[PDB]
Amino acid sequence: FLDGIDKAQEEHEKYHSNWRAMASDFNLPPVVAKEIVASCDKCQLKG
């Protein structure tokens, strides 16, 4: 959980990619990829 996300988290910061891209990059269920978006205030609160 925290191990894969730590790597995927860096990819998110580099491009703010959507949870779908992160999910496919690490092949993790939407929950793990979507949780990273929830930690990103920029991608979470979008307006």
Q: Which residues carry a binding-site annotation for Zn(2+)?
A: 12, 16, 40, 43
* Region for 25 from its dihedrals, namely left if φ exceeds 0, alpha if ψ lies in -120 to 50, beta otherwise: alpha
Phi, psi of 24 (to 5 degrees): -70, -35
Q: For residues 5-44, which are near Zn ion according to CB under 5 A? A: 16, 40, 42-43
Q: What radius of gyration do the chain's Cα atoms show?
A: 10
Binding to its own copies by residue 34, rule CB under 8 A?
A: yes
Select the binding partner of residue 21 from Zn ion, its own copies, none (C-beta < 5 to 8 A, by kind).
none
Under rule CB under 8 A, how many of the chain's residues touch its own copies?
A: 13
